[PDB]
Design a protein around this ligand. Structure first.
Ligand SMILES: [Mg+2]
Ligand SMILES: [Mg+2]
Ligand SMILES: [Mg+2]
Ligand SMILES: [Mg+2]
Ligand SMILES: [Mg+2]
Ligand SMILES: [Mg+2]
Ligand SMILES: [Mg+2]
Ligand SMILES: [Mg+2]
Ligand SMILES: [Mg+2]
Ligand SMILES: [Mg+2]
Ligand SMILES: [Mg+2]
Ligand SMILES: [Mg+2]
Ligand SMILES: [Mg+2]
Ligand SMILES: [Mg+2]
Ligand SMILES: [Mg+2]
Ligand SMILES: [Mg+2]
Ligand SMILES: [Mg+2]
Ligand SMILES: [Mg+2]
Ligand SMILES: [Mg+2]
Ligand SMILES: [Mg+2]
Ligand SMILES: [Mg+2]
Ligand SMILES: [Mg+2]
Ligand SMILES: [Mg+2]
Ligand SMILES: [Mg+2]
Ligand SMILES: [Mg+2]
Ligand SMILES: [Mg+2]
Ligand SMILES: [Mg+2]
Ligand SMILES: [Mg+2]
Ligand SMILES: [Mg+2]
Ligand SMILES: [Mg+2]
Ligand SMILES: [Mg+2]
Ligand SMILES: [Mg+2]
Ligand SMILES: [Mg+2]
Ligand SMILES: [Mg+2]
Ligand SMILES: [Mg+2]
Ligand SMILES: [Mg+2]
Ligand SMILES: [Mg+2]
Ligand SMILES: [Mg+2]
Ligand SMILES: [Mg+2]
Ligand SMILES: [Mg+2]
Ligand SMILES: [Mg+2]
Ligand SMILES: [Mg+2]
Ligand SMILES: [Mg+2]
Ligand SMILES: [Mg+2]
Ligand SMILES: [Mg+2]
Ligand SMILES: [Mg+2]
Ligand SMILES: [Mg+2]
Ligand SMILES: [Mg+2]
Ligand SMILES: [Mg+2]
Ligand SMILES: [Mg+2]
Ligand SMILES: [Mg+2]
Ligand SMILES: [Mg+2]
Ligand SMILES: [Mg+2]
Ligand SMILES: [Mg+2]
Ligand SMILES: [Mg+2]
Ligand SMILES: [Mg+2]
Ligand SMILES: [Mg+2]
Ligand SMILES: [Mg+2]
Ligand SMILES: [Mg+2]
Ligand SMILES: [Mg+2]
Ligand SMILES: [Mg+2]
Ligand SMILES: [Mg+2]
Ligand SMILES: [Mg+2]
Ligand SMILES: [Mg+2]
Ligand SMILES: [Mg+2]
Ligand SMILES: [Mg+2]
Ligand SMILES: [Mg+2]
Ligand SMILES: [Mg+2]
Ligand SMILES: [Mg+2]
Ligand SMILES: [Mg+2]
Ligand SMILES: [Mg+2]
Ligand SMILES: [Mg+2]
Ligand SMILES: [Mg+2]
Ligand SMILES: [Mg+2]
Ligand SMILES: [Mg+2]
Ligand SMILES: [Mg+2]
Ligand SMILES: [Mg+2]
Ligand SMILES: [Mg+2]
Ligand SMILES: [Mg+2]
Ligand SMILES: [Mg+2]
Ligand SMILES: [Mg+2]
Ligand SMILES: [Mg+2]
Ligand SMILES: [Mg+2]
Ligand SMILES: [Mg+2]
Ligand SMILES: [Mg+2]
Ligand SMILES: [Mg+2]
Ligand SMILES: [Mg+2]
Ligand SMILES: [Mg+2]
Ligand SMILES: [Mg+2]
Ligand SMILES: [Mg+2]
Ligand SMILES: [Mg+2]
Ligand SMILES: [Mg+2]
Ligand SMILES: [Mg+2]
Ligand SMILES: [Mg+2]
Ligand SMILES: [Mg+2]
Ligand SMILES: [Mg+2]
Ligand SMILES: [Mg+2]
Ligand SMILES: [Mg+2]
Ligand SMILES: [Mg+2]
Ligand SMILES: [Mg+2]
Ligand SMILES: [Mg+2]
Ligand SMILES: [Mg+2]
Ligand SMILES: [Mg+2]
Ligand SMILES: [Mg+2]
Ligand SMILES: [Mg+2]
Ligand SMILES: [Mg+2]
Ligand SMILES: [Mg+2]
Ligand SMILES: [Mg+2]
Ligand SMILES: [Mg+2]
Ligand SMILES: [Mg+2]
Ligand SMILES: [Mg+2]
Ligand SMILES: [Mg+2]
Ligand SMILES: [Mg+2]
Ligand SMILES: [Mg+2]
Ligand SMILES: [Mg+2]
Ligand SMILES: [Mg+2]
Ligand SMILES: [Mg+2]
Ligand SMILES: [Mg+2]
Ligand SMILES: [Mg+2]
Ligand SMILES: [Mg+2]
Ligand SMILES: [Mg+2]
Ligand SMILES: [Mg+2]
Ligand SMILES: [Mg+2]
Ligand SMILES: [Mg+2]
Ligand SMILES: [Mg+2]
Ligand SMILES: [Mg+2]
Ligand SMILES: [Mg+2]
Ligand SMILES: [Mg+2]
Ligand SMILES: [Mg+2]
Ligand SMILES: [Mg+2]
Ligand SMILES: [Mg+2]
Ligand SMILES: [Mg+2]
Ligand SMILES: [Mg+2]
Ligand SMILES: [Mg+2]
Ligand SMILES: [Mg+2]
Ligand SMILES: [Mg+2]
Ligand SMILES: [Mg+2]
Ligand SMILES: [Mg+2]
Ligand SMILES: [Mg+2]
Ligand SMILES: [Mg+2]
Ligand SMILES: [Mg+2]
Ligand SMILES: [Mg+2]
Ligand SMILES: [Mg+2]
Ligand SMILES: [Mg+2]
Lengths: 113, 118, 49, 59
RNA sequence: GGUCAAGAUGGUAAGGGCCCACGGUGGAUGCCUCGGCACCCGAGCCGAUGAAGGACGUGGCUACCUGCGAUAAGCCAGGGG
RNA sequence: ACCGUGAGGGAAAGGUGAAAAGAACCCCGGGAGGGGAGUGAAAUAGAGCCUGAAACCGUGGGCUUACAAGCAGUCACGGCC
RNA sequence: UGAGCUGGGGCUAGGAGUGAAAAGCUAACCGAGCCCGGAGAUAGCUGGUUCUCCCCGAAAUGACUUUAGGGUCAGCCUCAG
RNA sequence: GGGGGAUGACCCCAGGCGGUAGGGGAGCGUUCCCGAUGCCGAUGAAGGCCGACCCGCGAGGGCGGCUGGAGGUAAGGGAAGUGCGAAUGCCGGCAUGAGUAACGAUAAAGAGGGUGAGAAUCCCUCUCGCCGUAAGCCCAAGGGUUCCUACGCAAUGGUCGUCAGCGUAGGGUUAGGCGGGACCUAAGGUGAAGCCGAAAGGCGUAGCCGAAGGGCAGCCGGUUAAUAUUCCGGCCCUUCCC
RNA sequence: AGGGACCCGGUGAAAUUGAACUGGCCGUGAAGAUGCGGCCUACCCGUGGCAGGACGAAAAGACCCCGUGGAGCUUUACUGC
RNA sequence: GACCACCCGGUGGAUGGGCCGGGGGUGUAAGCGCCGCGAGGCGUUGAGCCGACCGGUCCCAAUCGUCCGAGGUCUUGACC
């Protein structure tokens, strides 16, 4: 079986957090944890939460044994945009968009004997 | 270019850089343990070592000297009487800088440990 | 630098106030238009009682 | 806005290739001396992990 | 078993391109509507007995709307049901 | 609403489902969010809710590419799927 | 210390005011303010003008033209008889 | 075009068929009407997504699967807000530059402890620096709950926030003497009398309105988380009526 | 010397943008070519820098002319008041 | 040396910091003693303080560690 957790409307830029997600793809849960703890990014925190919430769905909802699950799949999609006004010189007003991500960690049991 | 010229500038001018070290010395020689930025540490070793090694000399000059950088009448006392001894047979290396594996956040700075040896 | 808007409540009612509008026939129409557009305020709200 | 400015929108193929160097390098990690977990080298291993040095305790 | 000079050819993608599958975003298309538009009837003034339009209030708890006016989500009487 | 001292200007914004039956409880989480359970004919109808196109952004797969040069296609042969 | 500067209260305005005079100033663009209206002013000028197939297929000359990058008539294209 | 008399639509036959401005002729599709009290539709309408299939020169029409969940509408005629790629077009959405410039005065920071899921950024302590005719304090404008406290962190804060001038809630503004009005008059405004003007209206004596000017009786302390010349305490005055 | 520029963590715009797989010479072409010819050169992708070219961006040339366009000003231009 | 890269070390080690010595700069420290009413002067005193340059010394710090990385396509040609 495979299990997944999704953090949605997370107030962070996709392109930013996608960077650490790609860092755990295909790895054991044991390793992945050790990676996020010392990855120096704001995205670590969030991805950590999603991952741990995914495991906590495998063992308690799908029977998967924590010692055998890897990061089968992981991705982050673009949530809706927070458009905000940025006042500029000569009365301009730009619009910066505070971006938003949909983090999706998806776990599976390693095919170990 | 600017080779050699030993002595970090820590995005500070002269006076700030001085009172940086001094205020870091007091802070050390009061708790004997300090957590700072890795570079603010490396540079803080020699500044204190010199101060201690001077309080090993005991003379009031050495005292009157040190007072320039610590300005406080005690602590100097605590330096000369409670700390300066412990290094009598120890020549150099009065200080230790250990690196913490945890970084700050919203800053990301690597931190380090500064304590008094032995 | 000193800008165009220098608020002064006495001036505001002395100038665009309800009683000011009612004097001039020009003003009586301003009310008439605003009242017919269905404006919620016929006249700049001013205060400091 | 003023003097210089880009002349053509950059292709998806061309921004994506600019980013061909943006990947992260996973952290460098060794197993601690005696405490259980994994820690970065030359550092005070967060679960007290030093002998002749102090540790600020987890203990 | 190998070595060896000449020569001839594979795999490999940091990344990119085309295709396929599945999503994210976004809110077009379709269907819906009791809002609008048009013509045709009907109907046609209100006000010092203080209009029109408001301000402020008003509920056991009430931000706004609606209703009402210190008798304040309402009072009295007739008719309907 | 907002813009304007003022006269005046002047928007955007409709749709779950037959019925709230609007998701008790449990797990991760500070919350948000999700995973189960449950409701339902349908939950990528779960309330940023009918349909959900395109641009746009991702994940996975087939072919391909690091001695080539171009309005990116076309006509040939050939490999691989 | 002056033809000084300054608060508060007032008056003067659109062919009008004010101006130790620059056509300066009259709400961040004044050789004639702003709003709304006449109004869909007018524009011999620039731009744009959206499905398919089938047949024919021009002119950039002449004369007049406050006409010359616009027109009226003739010329040359087309359709019906 | 000529025969084929087939008058049909059908055959052989021979010719023409580059094309802008333009002329002409055929059709496709979109919305609505009659056809409709009909027919298609939950055994699934319209719309969507695929298709290497079928018919049409083409515009298109079919058919098949997936989606979708309540409409659709033939033959054949009728009427139009009837086909977009461009108008520095209009509205909206999303890209590019780009993880780039920037994060708003060069007065300046360091450590320890505390809270907290989370702290360079909140609280406390010590050290250091900056204003000090201010970058301190008190009035007036203007603003209108921003004040005090409890609970909070989605957004606002150019980062972070456990904090806040932010969100929810509760509280808080006390006067015969302070300011203004039941006083005065100034420019100016208004305006019985009066004068003028097609109407609207314009003037105008007195009077009236009009103030940061004239006139008028409160000083010092104390208390609240938040008010005080306002409450409290002590000393001191004003006007009106009898 | 300090504040930026560089590196790391956090936040994250802008004009511009037909699409791009965007080299040099000598020619050629609407007369000043990355894009056509011939030759030369050149593995793929970046980072910090310079400003010769993309007739680089910006502003539907303010000069010039055209329009039987407009406006301010003048006078023994015309005609009014 | 912008980042990267390059170079030297990583305990079997003198890599940096410290400490010591030398160089070098400053030019006679504090304290005490003497003279002067005093400002000061003299002696101790080339004292004292001291960034980089030349070295020394394990006192402090490069501990402990994990990860990647060949087994060699084919033909021919000569020799085993
Ligand atoms: Mg401004
Ligand atoms: Mg800095
Ligand atoms: Mg200084
Ligand atoms: Mg001034
Ligand atoms: Mg303004
Ligand atoms: Mg006032
Ligand atoms: Mg009237
Ligand atoms: Mg109202
Ligand atoms: Mg320039
Ligand atoms: Mg791509
Ligand atoms: Mg590849
Ligand atoms: Mg989709
Ligand atoms: Mg109706
Ligand atoms: Mg009456
Ligand atoms: Mg009467
Ligand atoms: Mg009424
Ligand atoms: Mg009401
Ligand atoms: Mg009744
Ligand atoms: Mg009844
Ligand atoms: Mg009855
Ligand atoms: Mg405004
Ligand atoms: Mg307003
Ligand atoms: Mg509109
Ligand atoms: Mg909708
Ligand atoms: Mg319904
Ligand atoms: Mg409904
Ligand atoms: Mg828990
Ligand atoms: Mg919390
Ligand atoms: Mg759930
Ligand atoms: Mg069921
Ligand atoms: Mg389903
Ligand atoms: Mg179904
Ligand atoms: Mg679900
Ligand atoms: Mg279910
Ligand atoms: Mg669906
Ligand atoms: Mg559905
Ligand atoms: Mg949506
Ligand atoms: Mg939906
Ligand atoms: Mg429905
Ligand atoms: Mg939907
Ligand atoms: Mg889509
Ligand atoms: Mg891919
Ligand atoms: Mg070659
Ligand atoms: Mg090749
Ligand atoms: Mg190229
Ligand atoms: Mg090609
Ligand atoms: Mg004077
Ligand atoms: Mg004045
Ligand atoms: Mg005034
Ligand atoms: Mg005018
Ligand atoms: Mg006028
Ligand atoms: Mg004038
Ligand atoms: Mg003047
Ligand atoms: Mg102006
Ligand atoms: Mg007209
Ligand atoms: Mg027009
Ligand atoms: Mg005209
Ligand atoms: Mg026109
Ligand atoms: Mg024809
Ligand atoms: Mg022809
Ligand atoms: Mg003539
Ligand atoms: Mg002509
Ligand atoms: Mg013309
Ligand atoms: Mg003609
Ligand atoms: Mg002819
Ligand atoms: Mg004929
Ligand atoms: Mg026939
Ligand atoms: Mg033929
Ligand atoms: Mg031909
Ligand atoms: Mg033709
Ligand atoms: Mg024809
Ligand atoms: Mg048709
Ligand atoms: Mg019908
Ligand atoms: Mg059914
Ligand atoms: Mg179906
Ligand atoms: Mg329809
Ligand atoms: Mg079709
Ligand atoms: Mg369908
Ligand atoms: Mg029909
Ligand atoms: Mg029809
Ligand atoms: Mg139209
Ligand atoms: Mg049409
Ligand atoms: Mg076109
Ligand atoms: Mg367009
Ligand atoms: Mg352009
Ligand atoms: Mg929107
Ligand atoms: Mg750049
Ligand atoms: Mg840069
Ligand atoms: Mg920068
Ligand atoms: Mg700042
Ligand atoms: Mg700053
Ligand atoms: Mg702490
Ligand atoms: Mg605690
Ligand atoms: Mg702290
Ligand atoms: Mg601190
Ligand atoms: Mg700070
Ligand atoms: Mg006030
Ligand atoms: Mg508020
Ligand atoms: Mg407060
Ligand atoms: Mg609080
Ligand atoms: Mg917040
Ligand atoms: Mg923030
Ligand atoms: Mg700001
Ligand atoms: Mg926060
Ligand atoms: Mg608040
Ligand atoms: Mg009193
Ligand atoms: Mg007062
Ligand atoms: Mg009074
Ligand atoms: Mg009065
Ligand atoms: Mg009275
Ligand atoms: Mg008076
Ligand atoms: Mg008057
Ligand atoms: Mg009058
Ligand atoms: Mg009259
Ligand atoms: Mg007064
Ligand atoms: Mg007074
Ligand atoms: Mg008084
Ligand atoms: Mg008194
Ligand atoms: Mg107070
Ligand atoms: Mg008091
Ligand atoms: Mg009292
Ligand atoms: Mg510098
Ligand atoms: Mg950065
Ligand atoms: Mg030539
Ligand atoms: Mg050339
Ligand atoms: Mg080409
Ligand atoms: Mg060619
Ligand atoms: Mg060429
Ligand atoms: Mg050729
Ligand atoms: Mg390149
Ligand atoms: Mg470059
Ligand atoms: Mg250049
Ligand atoms: Mg430059
Ligand atoms: Mg032009
Ligand atoms: Mg002209
Ligand atoms: Mg003219
Ligand atoms: Mg380095
Ligand atoms: Mg090495
Ligand atoms: Mg080693
Ligand atoms: Mg060394
Ligand atoms: Mg020395
Ligand atoms: Mg001496
Ligand atoms: Mg001495
Ligand atoms: Mg003496």
């Amino acid at each position: 079986m495979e299990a997944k957790a999704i953090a949605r409307y997370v107030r962070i830029s996709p392109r930013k957090v996608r960077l650490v997600v790609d860092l755990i793809r295909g790895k054991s849960l044991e390793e992945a944890r050790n990676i996020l703890r010392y990855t120096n990014k704001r995205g670590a925190y969030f991805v950590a939460k999603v991952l741990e919430s995914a495991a906590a769905n495998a063992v308690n909802n799908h029977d998967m044994l924590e010692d055998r699950l890897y990061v089968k799949a992981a991705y982050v999609d673009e949530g809706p945009a927070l458009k905000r006004v940025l006042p500029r010189a000569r009365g301009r007003a730009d619009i910066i968009k505070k971006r938003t991500s949909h983090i999706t960690v998806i776990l599976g049991e390693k095919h170990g004997k | 270019m600017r080779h050699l010229k030993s002595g970090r500038k820590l995005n500070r001018h002269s006076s700030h850089r001085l009172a940086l070290y001094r205020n870091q010395a007091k802070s050390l020689l009061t708790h004997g343990r300090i957590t700072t930025t890795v570079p603010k540490a490396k540079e803080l070793r020699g500044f204190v070592d010199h101060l201690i090694h001077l309080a090993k000399r005991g003379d009031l000059h050495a005292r009157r000297l040190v007072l320039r950088d610590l300005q406080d009448v005690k602590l100097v006392r605590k330096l000369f009487d409670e700390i300066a001894p412990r290094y009598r047979d120890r020549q150099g290396g009065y200080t230790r800088v250990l690196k913490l594996a945890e970084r700050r956040r919203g800053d990301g700075a690597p931190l380090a440990l500064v304590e008094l040896v032995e | 630098m000193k800008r165009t808007w220098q608020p002064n409540r006495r001036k505001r009612a002395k100038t665009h106030g309800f009683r000011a509008r009612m004097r001039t026939p020009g003003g009586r129409k301003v009310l008439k238009r605003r009242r017919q557009k269905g404006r919620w305020r016929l006249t700049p709200a001013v205060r400091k009682r | 806005a003023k003097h210089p400015v880009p002349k053509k929108k950059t292709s998806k193929a061309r921004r994506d290739a600019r980013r061909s160097h943006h990947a992260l390098t996973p952290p460098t990690l060794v197993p601690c001396p005696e405490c259980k977990a994994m820690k970065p080298p030359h550092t005070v291993c967060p679960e007290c992990g030093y002998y002749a040095g102090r540790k600020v305790l987890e203990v």
